[PDB]
Design a binder for this molecule. Structure first.
Ligand SMILES: O=C(CCCCCCC(=O)Nc1ccccc1)NO
Ligand SMILES: O=C(CCCCCCC(=O)Nc1ccccc1)NO
Ligand SMILES: CCCCCCCC(=O)O
Ligand SMILES: CCCCCCCC(=O)O
Ligand SMILES: [K+]
Ligand SMILES: [K+]
Ligand SMILES: [K+]
Ligand SMILES: [K+]
Ligand SMILES: [Zn+2]
Ligand SMILES: [Zn+2]
Ligand SMILES: [Zn+2]
Ligand SMILES: [Zn+2]
Lengths: 366, 366, 366, 366
């Protein structure tokens, strides 16, 4: 059984008047359509398609339980949380780097975080075999005291520290396949060996200029952070090989008691915020690889937490195939972009380059 | 002096109710924002920024002259033009492959085509040194009998045939740096040596699966078509080397009497419809290379014709830098994405791959 | 217990590329925002608010069962249904007057109709005490052979004829407070005494020019149709008096076995498609009058069926107060427009005119 | 010769993240389409249609020159101007009641104001016979120290005080047919006899609850302010009579040297922000009454200044007929809503009430 953790009010968070990610003003003309990049529909349309296909009726949807302040302050200093609340009450703002929010965004962020907490809690309790948390706002860029890149709270780290306090879990692996670097997760556990943090991301995209393969942790955490930068334009076969040659072997060696996927859908082939070429069947297969790892390593315990994804028209098909895999349910959904996205895939010269790139990352892991 | 060819009604063309490029229906939910991918604002926002900067007041803007049926039938069979008009009167439709239009789309396509005809005409007659035509709908995928990929009339080929009839021009080169393959231009002049057709495009993107480096023309046109596919994820340095090592030498060898650029802006770093990493200063520099080529080979005679470009927030900055180069004008516009897009650029390993790719294209040309 | 009948796919119906209700083309520029007037969000935002307030958790939400062909053919000729299905399969169209739809609109209309059928069926069988059907597309303008005014099937009449076939109910009253005339309901039952059809509507609005107070039925149906036109600019007190002096006495005289409210929310104070001045507490009060009537006349059997409503920002508050009344529940929702809409209400001179108007309608009823 | 005063950057002002006029947060869900009520397109679409019809080519369009600090401080205290600029430099805000703006909103307000200043200046200097200023943001609610109701500077009063300085003009009449009360204009000149301020508006609409027929000025201004409240639901014949029986006689008695119309188009039949029933031919006729008055009283000197208007689909046709009248030009534009709006007009009983209402206003004027 699969739990699906969602709440209407996560779709009411609004980043404000931006054209894509550009703040209005100076030379940036206001948009005439939907404002922003992290739009409500770039996440709701996934849920909409899961309703329309009949898939949601196969899942269990618990009522949302917001994070408490005690929950979030296992990661964040209370001063940040207090300033967040005060700014949110006053009409919204931005307390970090590219992390805007509107009035009431504090309550919505606390709610979104609670979806991740409860998804992990219910999987560890045996209430469901696995779970999907449709978080919005996302979490994986948020530092302990600095929100960034549309992330206002560290959703997954907070869910992990709650699981440690409630269940005493020893080892957790986070597999971050959102197309951007999970710098928040990396930072929060950088000197710890009990959380393996893996990030696969477009080389140099966000944070801009960052690659990170050499950043493997510090102190007790040395060897427990793993960055897999991939070149812009990499597609299905590049991601499959990175998972076969790097990600899955890392999980096997670490022996986690729980696997958490930070699942952004923005490596899809038409996303504006990156340059990758994944399609809906890429996400099905990557999910199947994680289902296999969780079955082999930690009794099936697998939690998928929504992060990025900005192509409103194509994110739903990528997320829906993921959910079909997670739940083991077949529906009648047909991805109308798949044939073209398969034709888009890199040819042999690019494929050789991607294979050589991943071989080098493996060799450098020693 | 730069002429700028535009008309309000080009922004009234509407592709219909699609989510991005996906027709609504079946599993595709209707969009709540702007419908379509070729949206009015993905072109109008370029014009808006050039007004706001003061650039437009330095250009000359002739009143638009629509193409006549006689003009367009120098390329298209009258039967296609007649069916286009009848379908447009009847409420719109799609007479080709991914070329939808609404009621009245026939008249707007004829108007758009007339912007290209007149821009070429005015440069050849000496009224302006160079020109930019803000065509919408675009033209470079349209075959003689089949519209395709948002292109309903073969804008540049029709403008070329009109210039041959009115001015007797002998040799024309078309430099197509829209991110997609200019298959319409290639097809229409494929057996002809009087028009050199060059397309730089994302490998396998649109038409899907097509690369085309070996397709060099046929009969008298053998050696007068030149495809430069580039891998997904290529950016500024790759395009610059492609122009220095392939495009500009091809122009030098051909000795054109007029250079026409098919300028789509969809190779920009955040376009949803391709995977490339150009930024606004890429377009400025590529335009300077074309201005230099025209100055050396054909008395400065250079026409730039708008094609694709789908990132509403970033296309304006790319086109504005292009227009500053074309006109030689300075404004106070600053691209707020430029620093980040510079950081996004491919690192050393990908750069070596791009150089190996272009070196192979050069070697294959003999 | 209140049943709430909704299905995700009702929000996927799309009227097409119109600016408000105006088809694109000729002098109508395409919209840059949401296309259309009957937008998905003009109905979904009511459901969104009911989720956010916690009210949906207090209701029972049965799974949708679409109308069958047998159901809809109790009202519509099979030829209409077949041409609708064939046009829908082929990409959508408009088979009547201002009733456009997209590919697959047939199945969505059959589903929307099933919400009304099930709401009536479940109230008559005692599964719920009363019910709300969030129909989209709406039904009350649809004639037996002709769709019109955004209405593709005659939702309420189909649900009535189904109820007669499955429960043998003798007398049904329809109270239509959508701001436009329920010409479809009026036509379908015009010569019948077993369905009392009451419409309160803005004088001359839609169908344009129609008032209708003298159209009281024909044959056996003479005295069983009741039109209550109200002048543009009428508000809360005018509607309340119309219900106290005309609508409720007609219900009392008729002795229905079931009351169905055709509930459009477009008499609200900021609707673009009418000129009325109702606010959220108007809808609470009018709903309470129908609850009281149903308690007194037919054992509490009350069904409310969504029709029109076009102000996306204010329809939610009006419908939410209606749902609070229907379910007898209170939430923390506060209407932020209420104070201003109360200040907007007609003053003493206009109020005297409205009383004079309603008194004339009463006197004419003999 | 008609001057048309417009600048691209007036369409870049953005009120922010509101659903219609409701700020997001608490119970107001963010919009998925265009944010706000005063949207860019609610004004630009009028300009767009005037381009498409060919009418703009018949007008003279001078380059905009913004208001100076000296210009605006003839009306506003320097402290307000300084706080406006500081807030705008720092990201936007709202310094009054329902007057939000974005970053750089100060420069755009100064530019908008300069359009009105120049339109008045050029008519008085004889450069054009009459003029239309497409102001955005609007002006007529702004008080000397408090912005209000989407108005950030007192556009028309600033233009008048500039005309007194530059031309020494003695008497100006302002005729405000925006559907809301021109409380800014009324307040600024309330004790002055050299400016006659007339406002026709929906009774009690905005400012909410205000009617004002008894507020006729104070001191030297007693008799030089004239409020004409009209009931909600009034249409063409009611406005025509108000102008024949009240407005034009007031102009004839006052003997102005210049007539300025504060032209909001929000009395149109489908505006969300009022309940009136004007159509495009109403605005043509009211403009002709003002042209006739200016020719009779002040040598043709007539300036029309855009204020409100929120129906994006219908405002263009209303303003376009206004511009045809003002310029004395005919185009091929046909209003596709006209026939329906004519059928919507009040019937005989409502028409008698409107006539009695206006007779009463006249009687109270003594
Ligand atoms: O040159 C061009 C044309 C770009 C076309 C982009 C590809 C869109 C496409 O192929 N869409 C589609 C695919 C399958 C089914 C429906 C639509 N734009 O600048
Ligand atoms: O002249 C004008 C101003 C119209 C302003 C109408 C806005 C309505 C309003 O005041 N709304 C509101 C009230 C309280 C809280 C939030 C919004 N427009 O043309
Ligand atoms: C490209 C500029 C901003 C990108 C933010 C990325 C957030 C995410 O991880 O989805
Ligand atoms: C053009 C104004 C009215 C159009 C049809 C409205 C249908 C309804 O909601 O009843
Ligand atoms: K990642
Ligand atoms: K190309
Ligand atoms: K009605
Ligand atoms: K007014
Ligand atoms: Zn991301
Ligand atoms: Zn293209
Ligand atoms: Zn209605
Ligand atoms: Zn107004």
């Amino acid at each position: 059984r699969t739990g699906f953790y969602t709440d209407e009010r996560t779709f009411w968070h609004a980043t404000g008047m931006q054209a894509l990610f550009l703040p209005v003003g100076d030379w940036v003309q206001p948009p005439n359509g939907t404002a922003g990049a992290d739009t409500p529909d770039s996440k709701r349309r996934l849920l909409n398609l899961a309703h329309a296909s009949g898939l949601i009726r196969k899942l269990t949807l618990p009522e949302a339980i917001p994070a408490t302040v005690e929950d979030v302050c296992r990661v964040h200093p209370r001063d940040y949380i207090d300033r967040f609340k005060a700014t949110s009450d006053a009409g919204g703002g931005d307390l970090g780097h590219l992390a805007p929010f509107s009035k009431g965004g504090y309550e919505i962020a606390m709610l979104s975080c609670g979806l991740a907490i409860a998804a992990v809690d219910d999987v560890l309790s045996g209430k469901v075999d696995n779970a999907y948390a449709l978080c919005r706002p996302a979490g994986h860029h948020c530092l302990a005291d600095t929100p960034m890149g549309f992330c206002l709270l560290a959703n997954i780290p907070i869910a992990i520290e709650a699981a440690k306090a409630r269940h005493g879990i020893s080892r957790v692996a986070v597999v971050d396949w959102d197309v951007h670097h999970g710098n928040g997760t990396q930072s929060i556990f950088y000197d710890r060996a009990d959380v393996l943090t893996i990030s696969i991301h477009q080389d140099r995209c966000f944070p801009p200029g960052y690659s990170g393969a050499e950043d493997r942790g510090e102190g007790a955490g040395l060897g427990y952070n793993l960055n897999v930068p991939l070149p812009a334009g990499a597609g299905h076969d590049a991601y499959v090989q990175a998972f076969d040659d790097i990600v899955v072997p890392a999980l096997d060696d670490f022996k986690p008691d729980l696997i958490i996927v930070a699942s952004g859908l923005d490596a899809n082939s038409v996303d504006p915020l990156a340059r990758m070429l994944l399609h809906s069947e890429s996400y099905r297969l990557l999910t199947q690889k994680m289902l296999d790892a969780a079955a082999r390593l930690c009794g099936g315990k697998l939690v998928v937490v929504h992060e990025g994804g900005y192509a409103e028209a194509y994110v739903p098909f990528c997320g829906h195939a993921l959910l079909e895999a997670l739940s083991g349910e077949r529906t009648a959904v047909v991805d109308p972009v798949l044939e073209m996205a398969e034709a888009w895939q890199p040819g042999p010269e690019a494929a050789a380059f991607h294979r050589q790139w991943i071989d080098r990352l493996v060799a450098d892991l020693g």
